[PDB]
Enzyme design. Structure first.
Site, PDB file in Angstrom:
ATOM      1  N   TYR B  76       0.806  -1.209   0.000  1.00 13.16           N
ATOM      2  CA  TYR B  76       0.000   0.000   0.000  1.00 13.16           C
ATOM      3  C   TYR B  76       0.872   1.308   0.000  1.00 13.16           C
ATOM      4  CZ  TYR B  76      -4.908   1.830   0.337  1.00 13.16           C
ATOM      5  OH  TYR B  76      -6.092   2.511   0.170  1.00 13.16           O
ATOM      6  N   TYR B 119      -9.660   3.428   1.780  1.00 14.02           N
ATOM      7  CA  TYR B 119     -10.685   3.935   0.865  1.00 14.02           C
ATOM      8  C   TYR B 119     -11.867   4.579   1.566  1.00 14.02           C
ATOM      9  CZ  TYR B 119      -8.391   1.162  -2.770  1.00 14.02           C
ATOM     10  OH  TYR B 119      -7.505   0.595  -3.663  1.00 14.02           O
ATOM     11  N   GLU B 173      -3.329  -1.972  -6.150  1.00 22.14           N
ATOM     12  CA  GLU B 173      -4.291  -3.052  -6.419  1.00 22.14           C
ATOM     13  C   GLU B 173      -3.942  -3.858  -7.640  1.00 22.14           C
ATOM     14  OE1 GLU B 173      -6.048  -3.784  -3.880  1.00 22.14           O
ATOM     15  OE2 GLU B 173      -6.885  -1.943  -2.976  1.00 22.14           O
ATOM     16  N   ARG B 176      -1.264  -6.242  -6.577  1.00 19.42           N
ATOM     17  CA  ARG B 176      -1.904  -7.325  -5.860  1.00 19.42           C
ATOM     18  C   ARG B 176      -2.657  -8.310  -6.692  1.00 19.42           C
ATOM     19  NH1 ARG B 176      -4.834  -3.706  -1.140  1.00 19.42           N
ATOM     20  NH2 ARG B 176      -3.057  -3.317   0.316  1.00 19.42           N
TER      21      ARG B 176
END
Lengths: 263, 263
Positions: B76, B119, B173, B176
Site C-alpha cells: 500500500y 478507501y 491493487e 496485488r
C-alpha cells in the site's frame, strides 16, 4: 484389435515397469477429460464396444504368457486368456455380460467364474487379506505362472485368487495411482517383495470415493473429508484435490464437469 | 537507497504498464514464500527497516514527477514526494510512524496527514465512491499533476483524495491482483477511462480476507466461502484457492505456512 500393451517380469527394471504403466494409462484415457489436472477415464454411458477394453499381455522369466483384459471405464481386470482358455469374472449386469463376449473371441474354451473380481471376494477365496499378500516382481512372476496353469489343474483356487490380487494391484491400482506405481517401482528397484502397507490399501479402498469427491468438489474443495492412512497406519484427512495431484493418476467418471465458471 | 521503479503515463502502452507492474511485484516480494502457487509479501514481524519500502516514481506527459512510497508488507501507498515536499498518510501505530521517518529523508518539508489512506476515508474526502471515479491513463496522468501541485495551493483536498484513489488502485491493487492489472491494461489498450466495476471493487475489498482464507485453508479449501461480485454485480462464491490462481498475484502475510504434510 483392442490395443495390447506388453510387460515382462523377466529382467524388469524401474524403467521398463514405468514405460509399461505409462502406456497402459495412455490406452485407458484420451485426455479429453481432465478435472484439476487429473485425467478421467471414459464415461461408460454411450461408449462403443470397440473402445471398451484394452489388453495387457504379461510374460515371465519362465517363458509363460497370459493376457489380462481391462475395462477402460474403471481400469479393472475383467478376465484373462492363457493359451486356448479364457476366464471372466462374474459380470455385474447384462450389459457387462454382453461386452465380455467381444473379448478373446477365437479362444476355444470360455468360462465365466461365479464370483466377482472385487477384493472382498478374492481375499475370501485366497484365505488372505491384501495386507498379508506380498507384492513385487517375484510375486508377479509367480502369479503369471499360476494363471497360466489354472486350466490344466496345476493351480488351486486360493492360489488363483491370490494371483489375481497380485495382478490387479500391480497393474490396475498402479495405473490408477502414481503413488502405488511408485511403491511397485521401489519393490522392483531393491528386489523387495512385501505386502502393501495401509497407505496402499486405503488408496485402493478409496479410489471410487476420491473420484467422486474430486469431481463433485466446489472448485477443488471437498464437501466431506476422506480419511486415508499413512504407511504407519496413522490417519491422514484429505480436504482438497490439490494434495492428490501427485497421488492419483486417473479417476472413474462420476459426473459431467460443471461449467468452467472462472472469475 | 530503497529500490525505485519508474513508470510514465506519457505514451503508456499495455507492454510498458505490464513491465512496470511486474517490476513492482519483483521488488515487493522475494519468492521465499509461495502458498498454492501465490506469492506472499514479507512478514512485517522482524523486517529490517532497510527492507521496508519501495519507491514508484511516476511521470506524466506534462513532465511532472511524483514519487510514491509503498510498504512491502501490504503493497500500500504510505506517502509521496513532489519536489521539496513529502506527505504521509496518518500512521496506524508508533512502529509505522518511526518507519516513515526513513523515507525521503532529505526533503525539506515533511508533513503527516491527519487522515489514513484507506478507501473509506479517501472517498469521504473526495466526495465520491470508487465506483464513481474513472480509472485509466488520463485519470492517472491527471492524478500525478494533482499530487504535484498540492504543495503550492493548486489542488483542493477532494481532488487530492480522488488522485490518491486513482494511484492506489492502478498501482497497489494492480500489483496485488493480475485481474486488476488486466483491467487497467484494457483501459490503456483502448484508451478508455471508466470507473471500476463490482469485480474490481470486491477484489479490493476482499484482499485481506482472501489472503487469510488461502493461508488458513485446509489444503486450499476455504472453511468459509468468500462472496465476490462479477462485472454485472452478480454474486460469485469463492470456495478454494484454485479459482484465485489467475486473479491474485500477491497476499499479505497472515500466518506461518503449515508443515508440507504431503501424503
Amino acid at each position: 484389435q483392442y490395443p495390447i500393451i506388453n510387460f515382462t517380469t523377466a529382467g524388469a527394471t524401474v524403467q521398463s515397469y514405468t514405460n509399461f504403466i505409462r502406456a497402459v494409462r495412455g490406452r485407458l484415457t484420451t485426455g479429453a477429460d481432465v478435472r484439476h489436472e487429473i485425467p478421467v477415464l471414459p464415461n461408460r454411458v454411450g461408449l462403443p464396444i470397440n473402445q471398451r477394453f484394452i489388453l495387457v499381455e504379461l510374460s515371465n522369466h519362465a517363458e509363460l504368457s497370459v493376457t489380462l483384459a481391462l475395462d477402460v471405464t474403471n481400469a479393472y481386470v475383467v478376465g484373462y486368456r492363457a493359451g486356448n482358455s479364457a476366464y471372466f469374472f462374474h459380470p455385474d449386469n447384462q450389459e457387462d455380460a454382453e461386452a465380455i463376449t467381444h473379448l478373446f473371441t477365437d479362444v476355444q474354451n470360455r468360462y465365466t467364474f461365479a464370483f466377482g473380481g472385487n477384493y472382498d471376494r478374492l481375499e475370501q477365496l485366497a484365505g488372505n487379506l491384501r495386507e498379508n499378500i506380498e507384492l513385487g516382481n517375484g510375486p508377479l512372476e509367480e502369479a503369471i505362472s499360476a494363471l497360466y496353469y489354472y486350466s490344466t489343474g496345476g493351480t488351486q483356487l486360493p492360489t488363483l485368487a491370490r494371483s489375481f490380487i497380485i495382478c490387479i494391484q500391480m497393474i490396475s491400482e498402479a495405473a490408477r495411482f502414481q503413488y502405488i506405481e511408485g511403491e511397485m517401482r521401489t519393490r522392483i528397484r531393491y528386489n523387495r517383495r512385501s505386502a502393501p502397507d495401509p497407505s496402499v490399501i486405503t488408496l485402493e479402498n478409496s479410489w471410487g470415493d476420491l473420484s467422486t469427491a474430486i469431481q463433485e468438489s466446489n472448485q477443488g474443495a471437498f464437501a466431506s473429508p476422506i480419511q486415508l492412512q499413512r504407511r504407519n497406519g496413522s490417519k491422514f484427512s484429505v480436504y482438497d484435490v490439490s494434495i492428490l495431484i501427485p497421488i492419483i493418476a486417473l479417476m472413474v467418471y462420476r459426473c459431467a464437469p460443471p461449467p468452467s465458471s472462472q472469475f
